[PDB]
């Protein structure tokens, strides 16, 4: 599965306005969901990263595209709750709908 | 939006995504000012968030 | 002047208040020692054994 | 027996700290991929009944 | 009126505040301020632009 | 200060679902009461 | 002692850059499934008052 293919499972899609830009590689290797030297370890997605990382990358690139000016590297720095708690709640919501 | 309270006008690009994504990105940038300002202006809520 | 809501200290600028809110009344550093799946168990254990609490050297 | 037990507790330099046991146990690393974690298991068992 | 939420100075217009932010707090990193960071990013952008033509100049 | 901030799912749902279904399926095998017997 | 220390710091070609150590450390690969990562701990030890 591709990044967007899996990220759409929670209705995270690509805006039509982006369809004229080469966003692929940026989302692939410029939106760090876990930079070792910056992220707090609490945000470490661990094994669920296989399906967690695309979601975080989509959120990161969305924020980066939001601000004006040149495109900058996007990095997750912290999740207030543990990444495990976030994954658990997401699984609950996925099961609910 | 053109200008939020406490911010500077024209800092949001047109490529801002619609829907929840746009909301999240806006709030993420706006986070710290809101939290600090709320503390000064309003009494604290009754149990942790 | 700008003020806190927990310790209710006062600050000359909003920026100084923000960093205080991000540093004083935040979570403790010891929480980061282990995974939540363990920390909850640790918390349960300590709460369970609170009855063994040592009495103050005044009642004795 | 109760009276003597209280007296002993009242006067003794010995102190019991459950934290010391938790600190020692939690030093051990293990994979998060196993369905069963002994560390969680023993901590659940150690608790007093009643 | 408007306040510079870092140095706590007051200003009559958003223009005056913005000019103060660009000029005075040119290198600050407080999260409450955005524009100095973007300007800083633009400066990085230009430096990369130099790296382009420095190994690919323009001929007449 | 805290009320429910420690609340999540605290066990693997797959195992519990498998367990719960299994027990329910074999629930018909259970014993009779002495009155009925 | 403060006087001499400031004088020393005033004139010295030596420069202390904390980043070099973190870069040398953080780049070490490790499995994410272990419950304790020594990298995080050692960072947490020398990070305070950085
Ligand atoms: Zn405070
Ligand atoms: Zn200022």
How many DSSP H helices and E strands does chain E contain? Answer: 2, 2
- Which among G7, F28, G18 is positioned nearest to A37, based on CA atoms? G18
Count, residues in chain F = 37
- How far is Cα G39 from Cα G47, in angstroms, rounded to an integer? 12
Looking at chain F, list the stretches that DSSP marks H as alpha helix, in order from N- to C-terminal side.
13-25
- How far is Cα E41 from Cα A72, in angstroms, rounded to an integer? 8
Q: Which two tokens stand for residue D3?
A: 């009276």
Residue A49 φ then ψ, to 5° = -55, -25
- How far is Cα G30 from Cα D30, in angstroms, rounded to an integer? 14
- How far is Cα C3 from Cα B41, in angstroms, rounded to an integer? 9
Report the gap between the CA of F19 and the closest CA in chain B (Å). Answer: 35
Calculate the alpha carbon distances from F30 to C40, C47, F24, F26, F27 in Å: 37, 38, 11, 8, 6
- How far is Cα E38 from Cα A16, in angstroms, rounded to an integer? 25
Residues with CB under 5 A from ligand 1 (ion): C 4, 6-7
Q: Which two tokens stand for residue B34?
A: 């809101």
Q: Count Cβ atoms below 10 Å from residue C36 Cβ, excluding itself.
A: 18
Q: Count Cβ atoms below 10 Å from residue D11 Cβ, excluding itself.
A: 8
- Which among B3, C4, B40 is positioned nearest to E17, based on CA atoms? B3
Resolution (Å) of this entry = 3.3
Helices A49-66 and A83-96, axial angle in degrees (round to 10): 100
Q: What is the DSSP letter of D43?
A: H
Contact A68 E38 (CB under 8 A): yes
DSSP for A28-65, written as a single string: HHTEES--TTTS-GGG--GGGHHHHHHHHHHHHHHHHH
- How far is Cα A65 from Cα A68, in angstroms, rounded to an integer? 8
Q: What is the DSSP letter of E38?
A: H
Report the gap between the CA of G34 and the closest CA in chain C (Å). Answer: 10
Report the gap between the CA of B46 and the closest CA in chain E (Å). Answer: 26
**Using a CB-CB distance cutoff of 8 angstroms, which residues of chain F are in contact with residue B48?**
1-3, 5
- How far is Cα E32 from Cα C3, in angstroms, rounded to an integer? 16
Q: Which two tokens stand for residue F36?
A: 């009925």
- How far is Cα E39 from Cα E34, in angstroms, rounded to an integer? 9
Contact D43 C44 (CB under 8 A): yes
- Which among C20, C17, C24, C15 is positioned nearest to C3, based on CA atoms? C17
Calculate the alpha carbon distances from G38 to A41, A45, B49, E17, G1 in Å: 11, 17, 31, 47, 37
- Which among A9, G21, G24, D48 is positioned nearest to C50, based on CA atoms? D48
**Using a CB-CB distance cutoff of 8 angstroms, which residues of chain C are in contact with residue A41?**
32
DSSP-derived pairing of the beta strands E10-11 and E2-3? antiparallel
Instruction: Answer whether D20 touches C (CB < 8 Å).
Output: no
Give the CA diameter of chain G: 51
- Which among D23, F4, D49 is positioned nearest to C51, based on CA atoms? D49
Q: What is the DSSP letter of D26?
A: T
- How far is Cα C8 from Cα E38, in angstroms, rounded to an integer? 34
- Which among C41, G40, D10, C31 is positioned nearest to A36, based on CA atoms? G40
């Amino acid at each position: 599965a591709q990044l967007v293919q899996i990220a759409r499972v929670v209705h995270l899609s690509i805006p039509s306005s982006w369809m004229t830009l080469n966003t692929g590689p940026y989302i692939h290797h410029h939106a760090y969901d876990f930079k070792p030297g910056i992220t707090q370890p609490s945000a470490k997605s661990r094994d669920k990263s296989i399906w967690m990382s695309p979601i975080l990358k989509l959120l990161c690139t969305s924020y980066a595209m939001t601000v004006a000016g040149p495109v900058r590297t996007s990095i997750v720095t912290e999740i207030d709750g543990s990444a495990a708690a976030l994954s658990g709640n997401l699984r609950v919501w996925m099961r609910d709908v | 939006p053109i200008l939020l309270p406490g911010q500077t006008p024209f800092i949001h690009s047109c490529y801002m995504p619609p829907g929840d994504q746009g909301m999240f990105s806006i709030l993420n940038g706006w986070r710290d000012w809101l939290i600090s300002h709320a503390s000064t202006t309003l009494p604290p809520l009754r149990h942790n968030h | 002047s700008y003020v806190c809501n927990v310790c209710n200290a006062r600050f000359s600028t909003m920026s100084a208040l923000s960093e205080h809110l991000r540093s004083d009344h935040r979570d403790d550093a010891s929480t980061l020692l282990a995974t939540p799946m363990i920390n909850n168990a640790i918390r349960s254990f300590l709460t369970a054994w609170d009855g063994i609490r040592i009495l103050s050297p005044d009642v004795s | 027996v109760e009276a003597l037990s209280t007296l002993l507790r009242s006067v003794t330099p010995l102190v019991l700290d459950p934290t010391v046991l938790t600190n020692a146990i939690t030093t051990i690393s293990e994979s998060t991929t196993q369905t069963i974690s002994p560390i969680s298991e023993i901590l659940r068992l150690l608790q007093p009944m009643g």
